[PDB]
């Protein structure tokens, strides 16, 4: 698949979205600098409205852990949650 | 070195800038889809102000030959020609 295709669902937990993004980025062939630029552009760009707004409030210096913790309330169970 | 750093000079002919961008893009490790998005984004973003304006009017999906036709003569003669 391509990193360009990873976009957050409207109810998708940030943690699930960033996990898909990171896994897809590992599989992408690119230099480390290009991967850093991919992350700096597309992760916030392709987040849902509430997560995108929270990420922007953290700023370009934000770490993954800070992003995940700041976004942890948002969205629904997601597709990995087990009810049955 | 990195495609991320290819930037047009203020008087640099657009075709000289594109030759540098293209050679560096060819050498970059990336999927063709990623290259295509790099070109859509970086070539314009890193163009000089005068060419950038014309390129944004022309819009995404213009061919190189159309970009060249639009940007020809914008700027100075560049450094290709030997005077001495």
Coordinates of C-alpha atoms in Angstrom, one line a residue:
Chain A
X1 CA 0.0 0.0 0.0
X2 CA 1.3 3.5 0.1
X3 CA 1.8 5.9 3.0
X4 CA -0.2 8.4 0.9
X5 CA -3.3 6.3 1.5
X6 CA -3.3 6.3 5.3
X7 CA -6.1 8.6 6.6
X8 CA -7.8 8.6 9.9
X9 CA -11.4 7.5 10.1
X10 CA -13.9 9.8 11.7
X11 CA -14.3 7.6 14.8
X12 CA -10.9 5.8 14.6
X13 CA -8.8 6.1 17.7
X14 CA -5.6 8.1 17.1
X15 CA -3.6 5.2 18.5
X16 CA -5.0 2.9 15.7
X17 CA -4.4 5.5 13.0
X18 CA -0.8 6.3 14.0
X19 CA -0.1 2.5 14.3
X20 CA -1.3 2.0 10.7
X21 CA 0.7 5.1 9.6
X22 CA 3.9 3.9 11.3
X23 CA 3.6 0.3 10.0
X24 CA 2.9 1.6 6.4
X25 CA 5.9 4.0 6.8
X26 CA 8.2 1.1 7.8
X27 CA 7.2 -0.7 4.6
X28 CA 7.7 2.4 2.4
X29 CA 11.0 2.5 0.6
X30 CA 12.6 5.9 1.2
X31 CA 15.5 7.6 2.9
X32 CA 15.2 8.3 6.6
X33 CA 15.0 12.1 5.8
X34 CA 12.1 11.5 3.4
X35 CA 10.4 9.3 6.0
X36 CA 10.8 12.2 8.5
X37 CA 9.2 14.6 5.9
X38 CA 6.4 12.1 5.2
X39 CA 5.6 12.1 8.9
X40 CA 5.8 15.8 9.3
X41 CA 3.5 16.4 6.4
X42 CA 1.0 13.6 6.1
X43 CA 0.4 12.4 9.8
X44 CA -1.2 15.7 10.9
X45 CA -2.6 16.3 7.4
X46 CA -4.5 13.1 7.2
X47 CA -5.8 13.0 10.8
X48 CA -9.5 13.5 11.5
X49 CA -10.7 17.0 12.4
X50 CA -10.5 16.6 16.2
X51 CA -7.1 14.9 16.2
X52 CA -5.7 17.2 13.5
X53 CA -6.7 20.3 15.7
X54 CA -5.1 18.7 18.8
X55 CA -1.9 17.9 16.9
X56 CA -1.7 21.4 15.5
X57 CA -2.0 22.8 19.1
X58 CA 1.1 20.7 20.1
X59 CA 3.2 22.2 17.3
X60 CA 5.9 20.9 14.8
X61 CA 8.1 19.7 17.8
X62 CA 5.5 17.3 19.2
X63 CA 6.6 13.7 19.9
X64 CA 4.5 10.5 19.1
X65 CA 4.0 9.9 22.8
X66 CA 2.7 13.4 23.3
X67 CA 0.4 13.1 20.4
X68 CA -1.0 9.8 21.5
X69 CA -1.6 11.0 25.1
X70 CA -3.2 14.3 23.9
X71 CA -5.5 12.5 21.6
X72 CA -6.4 9.4 23.8
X73 CA -10.0 10.6 24.6
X74 CA -11.1 11.1 21.0
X75 CA -13.2 8.7 18.9
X76 CA -14.8 5.4 19.3
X77 CA -13.6 1.8 20.2
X78 CA -12.1 1.2 16.9
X79 CA -11.7 -2.0 14.9
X80 CA -9.3 -3.8 17.3
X81 CA -11.7 -3.7 20.3
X82 CA -13.1 -7.1 21.2
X83 CA -16.8 -7.4 22.1
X84 CA -17.1 -11.0 20.9
Chain B
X1 CA 21.7 15.1 -1.9
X2 CA 18.1 14.9 -0.7
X3 CA 15.2 15.8 -3.0
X4 CA 13.9 17.8 0.0
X5 CA 16.6 20.4 -0.3
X6 CA 16.5 21.1 -4.1
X7 CA 15.5 24.8 -4.3
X8 CA 15.4 27.2 -7.2
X9 CA 17.6 30.2 -7.2
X10 CA 16.0 33.7 -7.5
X11 CA 17.4 34.2 -11.1
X12 CA 17.8 30.5 -12.0
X13 CA 16.1 29.4 -15.2
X14 CA 13.2 27.1 -14.4
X15 CA 14.5 24.4 -16.7
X16 CA 17.9 24.4 -14.9
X17 CA 16.1 23.9 -11.6
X18 CA 13.9 21.1 -13.0
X19 CA 17.0 19.3 -14.4
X20 CA 18.5 19.3 -10.8
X21 CA 15.2 18.3 -9.2
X22 CA 14.6 15.5 -11.7
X23 CA 18.1 14.0 -11.5
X24 CA 17.9 14.1 -7.7
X25 CA 14.4 12.6 -7.8
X26 CA 15.6 9.8 -10.2
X27 CA 18.3 8.9 -7.7
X28 CA 16.0 9.1 -4.7
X29 CA 14.7 5.8 -3.3
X30 CA 10.8 5.9 -3.5
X31 CA 7.8 4.4 -5.1
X32 CA 6.7 6.0 -8.3
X33 CA 3.6 7.2 -6.6
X34 CA 5.6 8.9 -3.9
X35 CA 7.8 10.5 -6.6
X36 CA 4.8 11.8 -8.3
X37 CA 3.5 13.4 -5.0
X38 CA 7.1 14.8 -4.4
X39 CA 6.9 16.4 -7.8
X40 CA 3.4 17.7 -7.2
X41 CA 4.4 19.2 -3.8
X42 CA 8.1 20.0 -3.6
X43 CA 8.8 21.2 -7.2
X44 CA 6.3 23.9 -6.7
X45 CA 7.0 24.6 -3.0
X46 CA 10.7 25.0 -3.7
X47 CA 10.4 27.1 -6.9
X48 CA 11.3 30.8 -6.7
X49 CA 8.5 33.2 -6.0
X50 CA 7.9 34.2 -9.6
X51 CA 7.9 30.7 -11.0
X52 CA 5.9 29.4 -7.9
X53 CA 3.1 31.9 -8.7
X54 CA 2.8 30.7 -12.3
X55 CA 3.0 27.1 -11.3
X56 CA 0.2 27.4 -8.8
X57 CA -2.0 29.2 -11.4
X58 CA -1.2 26.3 -13.9
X59 CA -2.2 23.9 -11.3
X60 CA -1.6 20.2 -10.6
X61 CA -1.3 17.8 -13.5
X62 CA 0.2 20.3 -15.9
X63 CA 3.0 18.6 -18.0
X64 CA 6.6 19.6 -17.6
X65 CA 6.6 21.0 -21.1
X66 CA 3.6 23.3 -20.1
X67 CA 5.4 24.4 -17.0
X68 CA 8.5 25.2 -19.0
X69 CA 6.4 27.1 -21.6
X70 CA 4.8 29.2 -18.7
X71 CA 8.1 29.8 -16.9
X72 CA 10.4 30.5 -19.9
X73 CA 12.4 33.7 -19.4
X74 CA 11.2 34.2 -15.9
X75 CA 14.5 35.3 -14.3
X76 CA 18.2 35.4 -15.7
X77 CA 20.3 33.4 -18.1
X78 CA 21.7 31.0 -15.4
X79 CA 25.1 29.5 -15.4
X80 CA 25.0 26.9 -18.3
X81 CA 26.6 29.2 -20.9
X82 CA 30.5 29.7 -21.1
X83 CA 31.4 33.3 -21.6
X84 CA 35.2 32.8 -21.3

